RNA sequence: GGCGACUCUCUGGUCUGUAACUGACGCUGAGGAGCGAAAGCGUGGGCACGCCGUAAACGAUGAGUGCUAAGUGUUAGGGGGUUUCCGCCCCUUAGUGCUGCAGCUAACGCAUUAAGCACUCCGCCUGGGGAGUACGGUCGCAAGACUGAAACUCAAAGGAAUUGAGUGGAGCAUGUGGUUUAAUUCGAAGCAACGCGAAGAACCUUACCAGGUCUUGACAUCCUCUGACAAUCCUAGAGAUAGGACGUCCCCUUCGGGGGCAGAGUGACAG
RNA sequence: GGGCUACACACGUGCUACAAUGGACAGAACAAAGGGCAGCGAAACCGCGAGGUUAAGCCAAUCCCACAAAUCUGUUCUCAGUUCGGAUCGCAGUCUGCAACUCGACUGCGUGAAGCUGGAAUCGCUAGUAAUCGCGGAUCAGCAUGCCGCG
RNA sequence: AAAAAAAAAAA
C-alpha cells in the first residue's frame, strides 16, 4: 500500500495529533509495523517517536 | 458419597438410559444446588476412575457393558513365577527333566524326559519355554519380536529376538528353578510311531542342565568319571539314545534326506580374535535332541492339521523338475542311476544317492549340486508338507525364545487347545494375519542366514 | 543354441522391450566368439559363466557379464559382449 | 570495543548539496598517545571508579588512491519528465546487501564494498613439536598481561577438493502451495484434496479484484394491463449503459371478455 | 481489463535427456479400438514446411477418419555435451476466436543448453511381467508431459 | 555340472 505521509504530503508528524497517531497503533496499542501500514521508513521513525511522546503524555495508552 | 454414587449408577443402569453430558445429568437428576452439583462431579470422576462408567469423546457418560517400551515391559516382568500362573498347569516339578545344550547357551528353549513303559514303548516329554505367557499379543516386546522375526547368531555375538532379561531369565529353562512350559507328551512304540499324545500347559523344575559334550562322553566315550557324577541320569540318557535311534531309523525308512554337510565353525576368543576354523561336527547328543524336537514338531503340526484351524507350518516344497532333471543327468556321469522321473521323485531316491556317494571323493559335489536342485524351506499357513524330512506335517514349536513362528504356534496352541476359542471370528482373525507373518518371518530368516554367512566369510 | 541361459542373457541385454536388438547382439557376439576361438560359442559362454541360491547365481552371472560388457571400450555391444565372454572364459 | 522507552543540556563524526574561497594545504605512519567485551582485583556501594588490556576486540579480508561488464533490493539526498502533487519512471552520489563477466585462484571462490589490474606506506610469515614455554624482563595491587628462547625431537604438519568413512536428481511441464499482488475464488483441504478439477482460464470459465455500470433491477412470483415482442442501422464507447430513427401483429374473442410476448407500470419481493 | 498461466520460491505429480540395444537418413512393413448430418472428407492439394484447397464416396465389411508406431534394412555419426537428446532465445510463416498482449497450438529457421545416468525413499518381476511403442475418441473456436478406452 | 552354500538341520 501507500505511505500516509508521502501521500498526503505530511512532512511533520505531531505527537499532539492523537487522532492521526491512533491510525498507526493496534487495538492493544502496539505500534503497527511498516509492512502493515505501508508507511515510509522515514515516516515510520518520525511516527514512532511521536507515538512514544504521546504515550508519555498519556495521549495514547501503553497497553489497551 | 457412596449412596449418591449407587443412586447415579442405578439411574444409568436403567434400560431407557442413553449417554448424557454433565449438564444433561444435572437436569435429569433435578440438581439445583451448587453443593449437589459438586457431589455429582466428584461421583462421576470416582465412578470413571473405578471403570464403572465411561466418558465418550463427546463428553457423555455411559455404562461400559452397554457400549524403550520393550525394555520397560522386560524390566517389569517378574523374575519368578507368580502362584496365580500355576493355576490349570500340570505340575511336573517332581519329574526327572533335563536340558541338553551348547556350553555357552543361556537361552534354554527345550527340556526333555524319557520314561520306558512296561509294554516296551517310550514316553517322551518335550517341555518348551512358555514365551507366549510373558510376550503377550500386541505387547511392546511382541511388536519388536515380530519385527526381528528370529535371533541372529553371528561369529562373535547373538542379536536376540527378545530382550536378554527374558531370553536368559524367566523364559530360559534355567537349572533347578520353577519354569512355565508348553509341553508335548508322546507315547512312542518300538517302531517310532506316536500312538498317543497330549499338548498342555505345565510347570517344570529341571533336575540338571547338561551339555552336548557331557552327554556324548556318557554315551559314546563311556566316561566313568562323568557317569559317576551323573549316575541317576545315566539310565535315562541310554533310553534317550535308543529312542532317538528308533526315531531316526523310522525317519530314514520314510525316506527323509540326511543333508550331513561339513560346515565351518569359526572359533573366536572373548576379545573376538580368531583362534581357529574347525569342521562343525554333529555329535550323538545333538542328533538325539534333533530327533526329539522333530517328533514334537511333527506331532504338533499333525494335531493342528486335523483340527482344521488357521495355523503356521514349516514347509519344504517339491524340487524344481528342470533343476532336478539336470542333477539326475549330472550324477549319471559318475555312473549313479536314480529310479524315478524329475516330475515325481520320492525323497528316498535322493537319499539313496547320498548313501551311495558316502566316503567317495565325489560326495561333497554330488551333495552340493543336489542341494542346489532343492527349494528353500519357508513358513506358510498351508500344510504343503516338508520334502527334505519326507513328512506331510511339519511346524516349528520347539524354539519360541529365538523364532517368532514358534511364538505364534504357542499362541495358537493357547488359543485353540487351552482356551477352547475355535469360533469363526477368532479363526478369521488368524487366517487374515498368518500369510503376512509367514512371509515376513521367512524373509527375516533368509536375512539372518545371509548375515551369518557374511560374518563367517 | 536351444539354451535358456542364452534366452536369459538376451533378456538382461534387452532395453525398453526391444528384444530383437538384444537377440541380434547376442547372436553376433556368439559368431565373434566362434570366429576367434574356433570353439563352440555356447561352450565358451558356459565357461565364461562358470568364472563369473542357484537361480541367483545365474542371475548375478548374467547381470555382471552384461553390466561389465557395457562398460568396456570396444565400439559395438556385440564386440564388447564377445570380449567380456572371452575374458570371463 | 559498541549504541534502542522519553526529554532537555553540552558535544563529536558523516552525506547530499552547491561552487564562494583556499590552492596540493596530501597519504601511510615504527615509535608514542588515547580508546579498548568479559573477568579479576580495590573501595563505599550490588553501582560508581582505578588498575589490569585480553577476547571469532582477527574480524581468519591493513590503510588510501586509480582503473576494469552486467542485472536487482535497501538507507540518505540530489536531477529530468509524464508529475502541484500524489505517485510511478529514468539519471547521479553516499551506505548497505544480492547474483555474476573480465581477470585471478590449488581449490573453494573473489568480483567495482575484489581475494582483478596498479602505485605508496605500515603490521606479519618463512615446517611441526618442544613453546608462548624457558630466561631478563616491563606493567600491575595481584592474577596475569607483555617481549620472547634453545637444546633436543620429528618427516612431515597443514589447505582445498575428496568419497566415503520404480521414483529421486538433468530439462520443460502441471496441481495445491507459498510468496508476490488491487485481485492473484476455491471447495477439496492425507483418503478423493498436492494432471484434479470440469472431457480443453487467451476469452467465457472466474469465483476475485481495478474500473464503466445498471436497479421489480439480470430476472420471477405477481398482476392489472395492453403494446406483439422485436428487428435494424445511427450515435457512442472498453463495452456495459443504451438513447434515437425507423419499425410491432394484443394472444385469442361464442365474442361477456378472458387470455401470448410482455411493452406497461405494477407491488410484496427479486437471487 | 486483469489475474487465476504470477513466482518469490515448496511439495505432490507428469514428460525429455542422459545415444550406440542410439542420432541421423532411406528403404519394407505388421495394430486394435474408437468416430463421422451439418457432417466425415479422399484425389490433387497449396505447401521449404506448418495451414488452405476443391471434391469423390459414405451416411458407414460399400467412403472418410486412417499412414500405428516401435522394429527390420543399409548409409552415416562413431563415444564426440556429439550425428548425446533437447532447453532456451532470435527470426520465419498457418489456423482459430472477439483478439494469441499478459497467457495458444504448429512450422519456417538459426542457436543448439542442461544432461554421459541422481543418496534416503519405496516397489515388484517374463511377453509385448513389464517396459517400449503406440492409437483412437471424448472434450472441444484454438490447443493434452491431462485423461479415457484400445492396440 | 567342479569351487561352493544357501535349504536337512545344528539349535
State how far Cα B356 lies from the chain centre.
36
Nucleotide minimizing C1' to CA distance for residue C25: E21
* Nine cell digits for residue B347: 525323497
Rounded distance between C-alpha atoms, residue C68 and residue C10, angstroms: 15
Q: With 0-12 CB in 10 A as exposed, 13-18 as middle and 19+ as buried, what is B98?
A: buried
- List chains adjacent to chain C, taking adjacency as at least 3 C-beta pairs closer than 8 Å: B
Residues with CB under 7 A from strand D: A 1-3, 6-7, 9, 40-42, 48-49, 52-53, 55-56
- Whether the CB-CB separation of B298 and B354 falls below 8 Å is answered with no
C53 contacts B376? CB cut-off 8 A: yes
Query: Resolution in A, one decimal?
Result: 4.7
3-state SS record for chain B: CHHHHHHHHHHHHCCCCCCECHHHHHHHCCCCCHHHHHHHHHHHHHHHHCCCCEECCCCCEECCCCCCHHHHHHHHCCCCCCHHHHCCCEECCCCCCEEEECCCCCCCCEEEEEEECCCCCEEEEEEEECHHHHCCCCCHHHHHHHHHCECEECCCCEECCCCHHHHHHHCCCCCCCEEEEEEEEEEECCCCCEEEEEEEEEEEECCEEEEHHHHHHHHCCCCHHHHHHCCCCHHHHHHHHHHHHHHHHHHHHCCCCCCCCCEEEEEECCCCCEEEEEEECCCHHHHHHHHHHHHHHHHHHHHHHHHCCCCCEEEECCCCHHHHHHHHHHHHHCCCCCCCCHHHCCHHHHHHHHHHHCCCCCHHHHHHHHHHHCCCCEEECCCCCEHHHCECCCCCCCCCCCEHHHHHHHHHHHHHHHCCCCCHHHHHHHHHHHHHHHHHHHHHHHHHHHHHHHHHC
Chains C and B are in contact, defined as 3 or more C-beta pairs closer than 8 angstroms? yes
**For the segment 50-109 of chain B, residues whose CB is within 7 A of strand F:** 100-102, 105
Nearest to A15 by CA among A44, A56, A63: A56
- Residue B447, CB, strand F, below 7 Å: no
Rounded distance between C-alpha atoms, residue B217 and residue B225, angstroms: 10
Rounded distance between C-alpha atoms, residue B61 and residue B55, angstroms: 4
Q: Specify the experimental method.
A: cryo-EM
Strand F nucleotides in reach of protein CB atoms, 7 A cut-off: 1-11
Relative to beta strand B194-205, strand B178-188 is: antiparallel
- Contacts for C25 with CB less than 8 Å, ≥ 6 apart: C13, C77, C78, C81
What are the b/e assignments for B374-403, b being 16+ CB within 10 Å? Answer: beebbbbbebebbbbbbbebbbbbbbbbbb
Rounded distance between C-alpha atoms, residue C88 and residue C81, angstroms: 10
Q: Which residues are bridge partners to B122 per DSSP?
A: B116, B188
Nearest to B31 by CA among B51, B59, B53, B11: B11
Residue of chain B whose Cα is closest to the Cα of C53: B372
- List chains adjacent to chain B, taking adjacency as at least 3 C-beta pairs closer than 8 Å: C
- Contacts for B154 with CB less than 8 Å, ≥ 6 apart: B451, B452, B455
Rounded distance between C-alpha atoms, residue B294 and residue B386, angstroms: 12
Q: Which residues are bridge partners to B116 per DSSP?
A: B122
SS3 A57: coil
CB pairs under 8 A between B and C: 5
Rounded distance between C-alpha atoms, residue B441 and residue B443, angstroms: 5
Rounded distance between C-alpha atoms, residue C62 and residue B50, angstroms: 69
Residues with CB under 7 A from strand E: C 11, 13-22, 24-25, 70, 75-78
Rounded distance between C-alpha atoms, residue B148 and residue B137, angstroms: 15
* Nine cell digits for residue B411: 499362541
What are the b/e assignments for C30-65, b being 16+ CB within 10 Å? Answer: bebbbeebeeebbebbebbbeebeeeeebeebbeeb
Q: For Cα atoms B333, B336, B341, give the angle at the middle one, nearest 5 degrees.
A: 95
Chain B hits for C54, CB-CB cut-off 8 Å, are 323, 372-373
Q: Measure in Å the smallest separation between the Cα of B308 and chain C Cα atoms.
A: 34
Amino acid at each position: 500500500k501507500v505511505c500516509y505521509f508521502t501521500s498526503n504530503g505530511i512532512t511533520h508528524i505531531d505527537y499532539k495529533d492523537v487522532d492521526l497517531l491512533k491510525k498507526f497503533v493496534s487495538e492493544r496499542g502496539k505500534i503497527l509495523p511498516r509492512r502493515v501500514t505501508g508507511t515510509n521508513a522515514k515516516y515510520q521513525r518520525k511516527l514512532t517517536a511521536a507515538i512514544k511522546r504521546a504515550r508519555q503524555m498519556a495521549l495514547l495508552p501503553y497497553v489497551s | 458419597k457412596e449412596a449418591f454414587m449407587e443412586k447415579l449408577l442405578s439411574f444409568m443402569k436403567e434400560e431407557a438410559y442413553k449417554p448424557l453430558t454433565v449438564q444433561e445429568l444435572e437436569e435429569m437428576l433435578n440438581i439445583t444446588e451448587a453443593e449437589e452439583f459438586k457431589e455429582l462431579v466428584k461421583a462421576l470422576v470416582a465412578l470413571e476412575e473405578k471403570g464403572l462408567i465411561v466418558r465418550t469423546r463427546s463428553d457423555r457418560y455411559g455404562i461400559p457393558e452397554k457400549m524403550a517400551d520393550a525394555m520397560e515391559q522386560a524390566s517389569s516382568t517378574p523374575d519368578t513365577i507368580d502362584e496365580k500362573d500355576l493355576k490349570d498347569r500340570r505340575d511336573l516339578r517332581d519329574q526327572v527333566i533335563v536340558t541338553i545344550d551348547g556350553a555357552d547357551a543361556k537361552d534354554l528353549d527345550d527340556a526333555v524326559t524319557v520314561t520306558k513303559l512296561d509294554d516296551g514303548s517310550y514316553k517322551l516329554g518335550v517341555h518348551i519355554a512358555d514365551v507366549s505367557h510373558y510376550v503377550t499379543e500386541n505387547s511392546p516386546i511382541d511388536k519388536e519380536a515380530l519385527e526381528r522375526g528370529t535371533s541372529v547368531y553371528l561369529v562373535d555375538r547373538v542379536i536376540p529376538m527378545i530382550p536378554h532379561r527374558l531370553s536368559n531369565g524367566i523364559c530360559s529353562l534355567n537349572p533347578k528353578v520353577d519354569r512355565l512350559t508348553l509341553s508335548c507328551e508322546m507315547t512312542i512304540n518300538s517302531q517310532g510311531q506316536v500312538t498317543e499324545h497330549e499338548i498342555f500347559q505345565s510347570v517344570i523344575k529341571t533336575t540338571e542342565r547338561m551339555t552336548y559334550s557331557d552327554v556324548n562322553k556318557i554315551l559314546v566315550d563311556d566316561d566313568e568319571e562323568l557317569k559317576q557324577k551323573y549316575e541317576p541320569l545315566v539310565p535315562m540318557f541310554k533310553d534317550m539314545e535308543r529312542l532317538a535311534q528308533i526315531l531316526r531309523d523310522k525317519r530314514m525308512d520314510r525316506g527323509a534326506v540326511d543333508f550331513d554337510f561339513k560346515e565351518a565353525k569359526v572359533l573366536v576368543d572373548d576379545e573376538g580374535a580368531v583362534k581357529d576354523v574347525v569342521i562343525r561336527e554333529r555329535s550323538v547328543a545333538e542328533k538325539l535332541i534333533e530327533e526329539f524336537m522333530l517328533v514334537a514338531n511333527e506331532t504338533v503340526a499333525e494335531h493342528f492339521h486335523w483340527m482344521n484351524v488357521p495355523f503356521i507350518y514349516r514347509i519344504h516344497e517339491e524340487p524344481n523338475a528342470e533343476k532336478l532333471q539336470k542333477f539326475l543327468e549330472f550324477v549319471t556321469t559318475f555312473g549313479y542311476v536314480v529310479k524315478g522321473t524329475a516330475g515325481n521323485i520320492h525323497p528316498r531316491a535322493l537319499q539313496s544317492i547320498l548313501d551311495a556317494v558316502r566316503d567317495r571323493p565325489e560326495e561333497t559335489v554330488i551333495s552340493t549340486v543336489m542341494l542346489r536342485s532343492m527349494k528353500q524351506a519357508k513358513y506358510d499357513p498351508q500344510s504343503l508338507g516338508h520334502f527334505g524330512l519326507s513328512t506331510e506335517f511339519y511346524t516349528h514349536f520347539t524354539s519360541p525364545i529365538r523364532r517368532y513362528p514358534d511364538l505364534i504356534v504357542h499362541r495358537l496352541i493357547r488359543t485353540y487347545l487351552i482356551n477352547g476359542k475355535v469360533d469363526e471370528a477368532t479363526q478369521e482373525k488368524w487366517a487374515e494375519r498368518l500369510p503376512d507373518i509367514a512371509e515376513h518371518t521367512s524373509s527375516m530368516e533368509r536375512r539372518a542366514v545371509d548375515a551369518e554367512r557374511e560374518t563367517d566369510d | 543354441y536351444n539354451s535358456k541361459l542364452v534366452s536369459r542373457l538376451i533378456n538382461k541385454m534387452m532395453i525398453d522391450g526391444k528384444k530383437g536388438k538384444s537377440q541380434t547382439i547376442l547372436y553376433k557376439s556368439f559368431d565373434i566368439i566362434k570366429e576367434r576361438t574356433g570353439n563352440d560359442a555356447m561352450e565358451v559362454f558356459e565357461q565364461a559363466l562358470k568364472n563369473i541360491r542357484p537361480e541367483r547365481r545365474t542371475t548375478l552371472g548374467l547381470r555382471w557379464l552384461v553390466n561389465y560388457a557395457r562398460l568396456r571400450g570396444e565400439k559395438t555391444m556385440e564386440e564388447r559382449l564377445a570380449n567380456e565372454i572371452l575374458d570371463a572364459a
